[PDB]
Design an enzyme around this catalytic site. Sequence first.
Site, PDB file in Angstrom:
ATOM      1  N   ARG A   1       0.402  -1.227  -0.346  1.00 48.95           N
ATOM      2  CA  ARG A   1       0.098   0.169  -0.236  1.00 48.95           C
ATOM      3  C   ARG A   1       1.043   1.108  -0.082  1.00 48.95           C
ATOM      4  O   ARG A   1       1.559   1.774   0.755  1.00 48.95           O
ATOM      5  CB  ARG A   1      -1.186   0.125   0.834  1.00 48.95           C
ATOM      6  CG  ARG A   1      -2.010   0.946   1.364  1.00 48.95           C
ATOM      7  CD  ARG A   1      -2.428   0.837   2.703  1.00 48.95           C
ATOM      8  NE  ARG A   1      -4.204   1.430   2.069  1.00 48.95           N
ATOM      9  CZ  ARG A   1      -4.956   1.861   3.312  1.00 48.95           C
ATOM     10  NH1 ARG A   1      -5.266   1.992   4.239  1.00 48.95           N
ATOM     11  NH2 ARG A   1      -6.342   2.648   2.609  1.00 48.95           N
TER      12      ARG A   1
ATOM     13  N   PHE B   1       1.785  10.416   2.393  1.00 44.10           N
ATOM     14  CA  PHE B   1       1.531   9.936   3.608  1.00 44.10           C
ATOM     15  C   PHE B   1       2.326   8.775   4.495  1.00 44.10           C
ATOM     16  O   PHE B   1       3.311   9.049   5.205  1.00 44.10           O
ATOM     17  CB  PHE B   1      -0.354   9.506   4.340  1.00 44.10           C
ATOM     18  CG  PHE B   1      -0.636   9.014   5.316  1.00 44.10           C
ATOM     19  CD1 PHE B   1      -0.021   8.509   6.269  1.00 44.10           C
ATOM     20  CD2 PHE B   1      -2.086   7.825   5.334  1.00 44.10           C
ATOM     21  CE1 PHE B   1      -0.245   7.971   7.313  1.00 44.10           C
ATOM     22  CE2 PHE B   1      -2.242   7.868   6.537  1.00 44.10           C
ATOM     23  CZ  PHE B   1      -1.901   7.929   7.472  1.00 44.10           C
TER      24      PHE B   1
ATOM     25  N   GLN C   1       3.264   1.824   2.981  1.00 41.35           N
ATOM     26  CA  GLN C   1       3.718   0.578   3.998  1.00 41.35           C
ATOM     27  C   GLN C   1       3.533  -1.294   3.377  1.00 41.35           C
ATOM     28  O   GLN C   1       3.516  -1.263   1.867  1.00 41.35           O
ATOM     29  CB  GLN C   1       2.425  -0.082   4.415  1.00 41.35           C
ATOM     30  CG  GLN C   1       2.203  -1.327   5.559  1.00 41.35           C
ATOM     31  CD  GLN C   1       0.562  -1.529   6.296  1.00 41.35           C
ATOM     32  OE1 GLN C   1      -0.077  -0.323   7.257  1.00 41.35           O
ATOM     33  NE2 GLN C   1       0.640  -2.031   6.172  1.00 41.35           N
TER      34      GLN C   1
ATOM     35  N   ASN D   1       0.080  -1.446  12.719  1.00 43.53           N
ATOM     36  CA  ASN D   1      -1.163  -2.117  13.199  1.00 43.53           C
ATOM     37  C   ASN D   1      -2.704  -2.304  12.997  1.00 43.53           C
ATOM     38  O   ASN D   1      -3.377  -1.643  12.411  1.00 43.53           O
ATOM     39  CB  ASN D   1      -1.096  -2.259  15.120  1.00 43.53           C
ATOM     40  CG  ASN D   1      -1.303  -0.827  15.439  1.00 43.53           C
ATOM     41  OD1 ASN D   1      -2.598  -0.818  14.886  1.00 43.53           O
ATOM     42  ND2 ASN D   1      -0.251  -0.227  15.647  1.00 43.53           N
TER      43      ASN D   1
ATOM     44  N   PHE E   1       5.800   0.956   8.841  1.00 45.90           N
ATOM     45  CA  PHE E   1       5.158   1.800   6.890  1.00 45.90           C
ATOM     46  C   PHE E   1       6.148   2.848   7.946  1.00 45.90           C
ATOM     47  O   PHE E   1       7.231   2.803   8.552  1.00 45.90           O
ATOM     48  CB  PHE E   1       4.334   2.130   7.396  1.00 45.90           C
ATOM     49  CG  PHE E   1       3.422   3.135   8.231  1.00 45.90           C
ATOM     50  CD1 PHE E   1       3.043   2.571  10.293  1.00 45.90           C
ATOM     51  CD2 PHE E   1       3.694   4.583   8.390  1.00 45.90           C
ATOM     52  CE1 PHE E   1       2.618   2.945  10.884  1.00 45.90           C
ATOM     53  CE2 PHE E   1       3.352   4.898   9.554  1.00 45.90           C
ATOM     54  CZ  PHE E   1       2.781   4.411  10.630  1.00 45.90           C
TER      55      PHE E   1
ATOM     56  N   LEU F   1      -0.844  10.541  14.726  1.00 45.92           N
ATOM     57  CA  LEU F   1      -0.304   8.876  14.572  1.00 45.92           C
ATOM     58  C   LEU F   1       0.033   8.814  15.998  1.00 45.92           C
ATOM     59  O   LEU F   1       1.001   7.982  16.329  1.00 45.92           O
ATOM     60  CB  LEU F   1       0.188   7.992  13.923  1.00 45.92           C
ATOM     61  CG  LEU F   1      -0.502   8.270  12.035  1.00 45.92           C
ATOM     62  CD1 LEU F   1      -0.136   7.121  11.293  1.00 45.92           C
ATOM     63  CD2 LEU F   1      -1.738   7.403  12.802  1.00 45.92           C
TER      64      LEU F   1
ATOM     65  N   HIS G   1       0.551   4.691  17.305  1.00 44.89           N
ATOM     66  CA  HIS G   1       1.887   3.444  16.336  1.00 44.89           C
ATOM     67  C   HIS G   1       3.767   3.302  16.986  1.00 44.89           C
ATOM     68  O   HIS G   1       3.589   4.571  16.647  1.00 44.89           O
ATOM     69  CB  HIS G   1       1.981   3.666  15.002  1.00 44.89           C
ATOM     70  CG  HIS G   1       0.466   3.215  14.102  1.00 44.89           C
ATOM     71  ND1 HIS G   1      -0.182   2.549  13.566  1.00 44.89           N
ATOM     72  CD2 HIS G   1      -0.121   3.515  14.141  1.00 44.89           C
ATOM     73  CE1 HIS G   1      -1.159   2.124  12.939  1.00 44.89           C
ATOM     74  NE2 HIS G   1      -1.501   2.974  13.476  1.00 44.89           N
TER      75      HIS G   1
END
Lengths: 31, 173
Positions: free
Chosen positions: B63, B68, B71, B110, B121, B130, B134
């Site tokens: 992805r 952004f 991943q 996660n 990522f 975030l 994470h």
Amino acid sequence: EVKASLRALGEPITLFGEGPAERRERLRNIL
Amino acid sequence: NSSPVNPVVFFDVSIGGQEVGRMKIELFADVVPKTAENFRQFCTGEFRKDGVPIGYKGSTFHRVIKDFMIQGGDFVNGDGTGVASIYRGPFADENFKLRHSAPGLLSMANSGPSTNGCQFFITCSKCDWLDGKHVVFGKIIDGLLVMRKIENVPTGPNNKPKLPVVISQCGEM
């Protein structure tokens, strides 16, 4: 020591799943 | 400064079958040792399951979200549902000492509290929202260009790359 030598040469000290003998041989071919 | 040197690993990335460079990553072992070690081993293939080395070699970045993150690390299912660790199954969030304050940071993906596995990522921008959710465990120290190449890959639905983004080779520096 193999690892420190490869490190001194800026080479990876370990490739994925690489064993001792393979690591030694990799360095041997570079010298 | 007689501080132990943090582990440095590398991913050789391939896009659409063509090699595009190496990314070297420092793993913050002196901040999140458990998380850093889990990752280093998946880079070296030192962790074996049923006599077979397991890890990121040959895995993909499933992805890519421009501006952004990118991943990957799902060497189990290659679609984001895979979970595996050297601690067997998901493991706890070590700590949230580090933030997603800049591009190039490595952080654990996660599916809720304490569900860390093998997926991770790389930040492409600052990801304030975030922090605390994470675990940030490393950063790119060389090859930021490769990350930007990865980030620009064309994607389709759910931002899945249209061309294969593969970690052709990996290990430790």
